[PDB]
Amino acid sequence: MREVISIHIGQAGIQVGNACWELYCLEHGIQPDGQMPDAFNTFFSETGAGKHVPRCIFLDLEPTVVDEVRTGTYRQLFHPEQLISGKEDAANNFARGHYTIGKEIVDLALDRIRKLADNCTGLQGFLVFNAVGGGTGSGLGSLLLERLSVDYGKKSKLGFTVYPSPQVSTAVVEPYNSVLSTHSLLEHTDVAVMLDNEAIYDICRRSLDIERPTYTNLNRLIAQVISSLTASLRFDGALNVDITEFQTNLVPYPRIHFMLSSYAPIISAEKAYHEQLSVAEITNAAFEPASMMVKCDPRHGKYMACCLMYRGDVVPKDVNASVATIKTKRTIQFVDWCPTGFKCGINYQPPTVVPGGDLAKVQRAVCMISNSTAIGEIFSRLDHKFDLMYAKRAFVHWYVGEGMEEGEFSEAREDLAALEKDFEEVGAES
Amino acid sequence: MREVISIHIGQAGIQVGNACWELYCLEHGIQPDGQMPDAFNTFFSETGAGKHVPRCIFLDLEPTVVDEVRTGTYRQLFHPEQLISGKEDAANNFARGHYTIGKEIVDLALDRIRKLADNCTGLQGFLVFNAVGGGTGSGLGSLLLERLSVDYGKKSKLGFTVYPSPQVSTAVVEPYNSVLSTHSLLEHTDVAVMLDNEAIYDICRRSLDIERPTYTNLNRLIAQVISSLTASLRFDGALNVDITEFQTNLVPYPRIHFMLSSYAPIISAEKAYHEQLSVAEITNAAFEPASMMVKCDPRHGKYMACCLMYRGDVVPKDVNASVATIKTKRTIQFVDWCPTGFKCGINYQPPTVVPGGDLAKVQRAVCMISNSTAIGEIFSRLDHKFDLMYAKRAFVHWYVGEGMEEGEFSEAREDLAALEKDFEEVGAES
Amino acid sequence: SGRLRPGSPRGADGRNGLYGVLQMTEAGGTDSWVGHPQIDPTKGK
Amino acid sequence: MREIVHIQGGQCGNQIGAKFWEVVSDEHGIDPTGTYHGDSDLQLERINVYFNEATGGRYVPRAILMDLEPGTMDSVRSGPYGQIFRPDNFVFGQTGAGNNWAKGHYTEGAELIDSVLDVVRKEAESCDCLQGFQVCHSLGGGTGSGMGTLLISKIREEYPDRMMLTFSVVPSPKVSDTVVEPYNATLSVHQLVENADECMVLDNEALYDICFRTLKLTTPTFGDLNHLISAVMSGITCCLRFPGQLNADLRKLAVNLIPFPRLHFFMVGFTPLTSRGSQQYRALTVPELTQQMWDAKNMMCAADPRHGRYLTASALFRGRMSTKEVDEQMLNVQNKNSSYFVEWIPNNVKSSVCDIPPKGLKMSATFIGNSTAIQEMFKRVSEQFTAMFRRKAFLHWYTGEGMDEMEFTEAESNMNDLVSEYQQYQD
Amino acid sequence: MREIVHIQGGQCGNQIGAKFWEVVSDEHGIDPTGTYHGDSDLQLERINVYFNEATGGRYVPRAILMDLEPGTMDSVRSGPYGQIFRPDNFVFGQTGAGNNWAKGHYTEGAELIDSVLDVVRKEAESCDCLQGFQVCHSLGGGTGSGMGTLLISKIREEYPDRMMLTFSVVPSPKVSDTVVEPYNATLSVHQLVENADECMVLDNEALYDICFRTLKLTTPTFGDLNHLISAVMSGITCCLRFPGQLNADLRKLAVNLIPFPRLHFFMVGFTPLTSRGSQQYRALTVPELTQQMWDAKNMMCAADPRHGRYLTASALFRGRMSTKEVDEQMLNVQNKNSSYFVEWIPNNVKSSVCDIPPKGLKMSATFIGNSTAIQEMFKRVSEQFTAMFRRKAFLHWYTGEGMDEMEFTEAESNMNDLVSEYQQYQD
Ligand SMILES: Nc1nc2c(ncn2[C@@H]2O[C@H](COP(=O)(O)OP(=O)(O)OP(=O)(O)O)[C@@H](O)[C@H]2O)c(=O)[nH]1
């Protein structure tokens, strides 16, 4: 059966996953204790008599974010010993989370992975949730993905990593942590999905018209992106898209696997009655640059490949009609060597809305994830800011003391240089 | 399918629009919330289940008039992002409306016509409402028609425009804004209709018999003029006329497109019972100067082309007889090179009375739109007062401070100067 | 023992399939267009 | 088995044919649903001329409805007898002509006329033998004038051996429904002289006078006007849809009435027009039918027959009639006023008899006249054209679609040539 | 007593065949429970072509469902008419090909085909006479294309004298549903040309045009496209299931439609397709279906038949009809556009008559056309493969499953050779 294991690393992994698992219970009717009053098999495990346990581990060195789940309203849904904790956090240091304090915890993590892998019959992928800005999500996140690749070869892994914003930075050593984190994201993860905070901040102020959004509002709609992506394994439709289907259609080159994300219909409550929800205009809203979940302009680069995760009552003619109008517009640009650039997937269940959420009930939904050459500027601003602080050797003595030495900054830098020339050479016309 | 997009700029545009969209709901049974308890496609788009949203925009720099729509009885009818607001008003400065504080709103505006353009199937024209007396109506009106020309080419933008009266004026700087806005109005607007406040003041005093009319009572009969000429697209008749029918039949020369307006049975409640309203009687009363929307004597000029739009129980013979009676009469004088001076349009639905309004329920009404040579007397009036203030260079430092240079006033003067020779050349016999 | 199957979308008038359209039954029903492809019956003046 | 394919063009053309298919089906007995309910075998004997047999007894007309504004197809569909037409024959566009001849002929005509000829060639190739095409339009508009003459010129190239019976509503002298009536007419008549095999000129001002003087109708609507022209169109093809004593089909009248190829415009009148009050007083006999036939007011064209000589006139008598009063009354109208007839044609007038009358009426006749008095109708429109053309009024719109000023001169040159040819034989 | 084994591959094959097995079961009058409830003895006369006798009168189909994703086989068993298929034919995998032609053929497909080959050998040896094999798949996929063409290779080397009808949905040039459409299609054609005896070409945009233009359907859903494809496959084998005046089985059409062994790709449209509002207006006659038969819009392949000459065309008329009316219409279309047919094979289009029509139809026809106009479709796939192969984009998934660079060059080699031979005979 369709089985996926979602690992959650760092505080941003837990907070996104806590909102992600909030949406999963409402879609499949699971009461928060874990008693339902065969779609549950993708994310939940049958357990004895009327009990369902999630196929996830909430691992974080910081105890206070995990302990919120233990004392929260989902104390009985999760397995008590899946929620791996630690003594002290990584203190936003890649060196601590990967070498010193993350070594004794990652061995307990792979023991949890093996028991969850033996329970599932056919495992289809790993959804890793972390942020490259922090020490735990980068240091322990790279450590977890190293052991998972050797333990499980040729098996797909999807990376939903939150990257620093150009204007908003909640910590100082985020450019240092992201460069070290992205060293592992190339050779280990087969699909990486870029995320950014200030872009989702810009969506909430305009589309959701909320004036001061919090992290909870950001986490609730990124959950809708995950649930729209995995909806084909749970709910069937006209054109199903597997998890293993994503790698063949969106990764043309082995080192090119970073993808933007976009959820097209994002409409508040009173807005929806006046708005005409149609297949054509939602597809047009999907490609609109302010609907990107990552702070980037798609007009700067050219689209390499795209996948359209349609949901709800969508006839396959209308998506065929909508895609044709998308190709005709000159405002977007496709790369010259890829005439067949669109993946379409239709699911027949509309996305459920959580009570009290900002999103309103919509009959149709389109999740837009594309591989683009415009993603190169997102790595460039992190590359340039990294070299500014590394020029005068700032915040290095923290990394020097705990395991790492001065060399590993150079190989992490020049691997991003190989990434930067990869996007420019491939996107160039031949 | 037929549909028209209504655009209302400025406080004069919104207040007519409040009276306009009050009227359009009455012919189609739309309640103020927006639920009908299929001829509405010209003005309303069927959204979702049983909700209609107007095909309009309410844009104004001054927020004090757009929020009255938002807080009024038509809160639920209009889409909230459809109504466009601004931080500060133009303060009757054309330079502010065109250069300084006008560019930041027009970018948001053109994204909103575009979404109404994609929602609608086959567009017939744009109905633009503005007044040249104010900086918002002139400045933003001049910008908006220019952007619609380069985006939607050869689409008949049919305009209704309010002009300063000789006897009564509400602002000192009206002649500067009128001349500047007219220069953009020649090269952009395909069909423009002349409106003047003091003639309607005489209409309210003489025909409707109201001693103190207000601006609300003015726009109520103005909206009847808008609804009558567009009623042919909404409801079938014996001789229907479209928006494209007007431009190819009432515009003899590409710069001579300034057509007058007149209405028939402008008759109060108690006056309607005693009045014997017949097709011959209402045609004669249409061409009287008392029923003219603009304070200009048509006896001084020659009618180049006139169009009659009849509504109600009009047999086509009686309108055919009324054409012969007007042309035989010596007082109404036509130009020597246009024997076919008239166009008849018959619609089968009588005008709908606004409840609580001053107009009465009437079976038959005629909207008289005429292209005459007496419009040049209005433009000779505005040319004289413009030269009086410009000689001493009065109220110019407001304009040249806010972006403009001195040269725009002279070129607008010369361009408007060539209009009165053009109206004299077209009127002179040969 | 299976998969959740949501209802496949039906547009209007309960057209379950091409049974009537092929096998020549239930004639006289509404169509998508009669003239230009944009227009539809019962919509107009 | 002499089939006629009918095409309706424009707002006026759709409305005149809407009443036309209502009348001719009422004569043949087809209900608005489509079945047959006549009480005579002769009604169903010749239905192939205007209807196609379908499965289950349904009859579909050989009608193609064309325009550019979807308002009129809403008018013909919502009106009675509007469900009989083929849904595939509803070919048109969405832009609207806007009463511009150049737009109706050049810009949107390229996309429209490709689809319409596919429908027309489907109707023509279905039937075994063609007699001709009966089109109806107006000359004052642009939706049926420019688009229709584009169709007529294109369909005569495809089928040159079949006749073209066109019905035109020309502009009025007294009034004008559109401002650009001289522009639309003079370009349309420039196209009708070389393409249409014969034309039957109609106009509202002659119909309005008939609806008030003879018919005495209180409220003549366009539905009232449409029935008068439609009553002719049934009577022209009466020898085709019905057997007759002296048969005269659509090619019989073509060679009889037309001396020269340029002179193919007719003034038409329907004879037994009575008011509701004067139904009992008037005795339906042939000699009083002839004086109403040759009355100037009974002509459905504004040209006055007294001003010019008749070249050749034809009469289509219907009913149980004997053929001396068919012939002596047509002989008597010659000798009573021989100055009003062309000298170099002996017995200018003409007649034929069909023994099947219309529904409920005993005697009827339809009059076709080719007189030189119609020159002042073309002289006036040419006079109205040259006044506007010198000042170039209402021309920046027409030159927008791509009509150069040379084509307007050539259209006016043909009008002066055509009006002089009628004056050539008048002397 | 002629049997064909039905095999469905991939999501496209399983969904089309499930709707296909609904139609022929409805045509043969058997309930979804599996018994017989028809009112005619002609329906039960030949059921062995599609159904095997079971105990209690159960009629199990000769269907073998083979795929990778277990959701697809769970979908067919959940829907109506899904209990007719035997679970011993439900062979399936777990991993899923993920639209990888190399994964469905070389690496993963080895562990499944040995199970599939045992099942298809069981169905073949049970019946006495094998007429052929009927498989349904697509070309842009990886489950039905990589593994489906592997089945064609193994079943032809073991049954070399038996027919092979492949109904394949080619990628659309206009719209792309996946990103690896030309990679999978050119590799699938590279295997199909030497193994598949008769290949049928379908595509989604031609089905969408028929449902909008001719059928005038408001919302043509995902299952509506399969129903017209189902109507195609029931029309090809109408000779086997029902008696006819002139017989034409699979081998009859094999020798007729195939001049040379490499040219076997065909294209088929169903004839009596009308909108629900236009059923009562149309008259169904042999010339009426023939005109709709040769129209370009009625074809279920996006290749334009006006561009390329027809090498050989076949028609399978169904119902009681005059035989020369079918015959003279083939002579009628041979003379009206002889340039549209090929010259060195005179009398290209040739037909067959069956007296048993489908349910509710008085008359129908299934038209098979082997035309050189299909070469513009294959070069559209070929030019997309060459554009992607020069940059080696989306290629490391294929070479990770054991595919060397030589297989792509050979796939492009005979693809250009195939469009060369079609172009060579067009001259
Ligand atoms: N989308 C989203 N991002 C978050 C949220 N909370 C924190 N983040 C991101 O996470 C970053 C903070 O670093 P983390 O990766 O969370 O730190 P960590 O993994 O806990 O490592 P330590 O703090 O050393 O234990 C911030 O810059 C945010 O961008 C959240 O609720 N939603």
Ligand SMILES: Nc1nc2c(ncn2[C@@H]2O[C@H](COP(=O)(O)OP(=O)(O)OP(=O)(O)O)[C@@H](O)[C@H]2O)c(=O)[nH]1
């Ligand atoms: N007919 C009519 N005219 C009005 C009405 N209200 C204002 N006007 C006229 O419109 C003129 C000014 O028009 P606008 O440009 O819209 O004024 P505005 O939008 O407030 O522009 P600013 O004052 O610069 O903000 C005034 O001189 C009035 O004569 C109204 O309700 N009806």
Ligand SMILES: Nc1nc2c(ncn2[C@@H]2O[C@H](COP(=O)(O)OP(=O)(O)O)[C@@H](O)[C@H]2O)c(=O)[nH]1
């Ligand atoms: N008899 C009759 N004449 C009509 C009708 N409708 C319009 N007309 C005439 O048509 C002329 C206007 O032409 P128009 O309809 O604009 O032509 P179009 O451009 O082809 O649509 C007028 O002089 C009317 O008298 C009708 O229903 N009956």
Ligand SMILES: Nc1nc2c(ncn2[C@@H]2O[C@H](COP(=O)(O)OP(=O)(O)O)[C@@H](O)[C@H]2O)c(=O)[nH]1
């Ligand atoms: N007409 C039709 N086309 C289909 C159907 N299912 C899939 N397709 C087409 O097949 C292509 C996708 O192939 P896919 O299902 O992934 O092949 P697979 O790898 O064998 O599962 C798309 O282009 C669809 O247009 C169907 O039921 N009907």
Ligand SMILES: [Mg+2]
């Ligand atoms: Mg932390």
Ligand SMILES: [Mg+2]
């Ligand atoms: Mg103001």
